[PDB]
Amino acid sequence: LHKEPATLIKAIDGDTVKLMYKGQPMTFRLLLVDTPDTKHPKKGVEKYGPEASAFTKKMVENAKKIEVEFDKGQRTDKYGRGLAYIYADGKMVNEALVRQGLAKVAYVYKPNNTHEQHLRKSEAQAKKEKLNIWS
Ligand SMILES: Cc1cn([C@H]2C[C@H](OP(=O)(O)O)[C@@H](COP(=O)(O)O)O2)c(=O)[nH]c1=O
Ligand SMILES: [Ca+2]
C-alpha cells in the first residue's frame, strides 16, 4: 500500500474527516472501524459518540503531518467518501480508536482488509482491558 500526504480541512466525527487530497477537498471514512454516531437522526448521540469524535479531532488537529493509505480494492464507498487508513504523525488513527475501545472493527469488505489482523488484535486487547465501549 503507500502513504500519500493530505491536509486537514476538518474532522466530522469519530470515523469521518474531510481532507484536501491532491488539491481537492474530499470526505474520508476510516477503513475497518465504526465509532458511535453522534448525529443519529433526532437521537443526537450514541454512547461514546462524543468521546470517539473528540479523540479523532484531537489526534488530527494536533498532527504536524497527515497521510492517507488506500487499501487494495474500491477507494470510495457508495456515498463518494474516500476509504483509507489515516495516519497522524505516523500513528494510524483507525488503530488508535480500536485500541482505546472507542471503535469496533466493522465493515470488513475483501479485498480492503490489509490491516484487519492488526486491528483485530488491538480490539482484543481493548476488550481484555474493558475500555469504553467494552466497559
Ligand atoms: C467503512 C465502510 C463503510 N461503508 C458503508 C456501509 C454503510 O452503508 P449504509 O449507510 O448503507 O449503512 C455505511 C457505514 O457508514 P457510517 O458508519 O459512516 O454510517 O457505509 C462502505 O460501503 N464500505 C466501507 O468500507
Ligand atoms: Ca460510524
UniProtKB/Swiss-Prot annotation:
Location in or out of the cell: Secreted
Annotated active site: 29, 37, 81
Highest taxon of source: Bacteria
Binding residues for Ca(2+): 15, 34-35
Amino acid composition bias (Basic and acidic residues), ranges on this chain: 115-131
Residues covered by region (Disordered): 115-135
Segments passing through the bilayer: none
Protein name listed in UniProt: Nuclease A
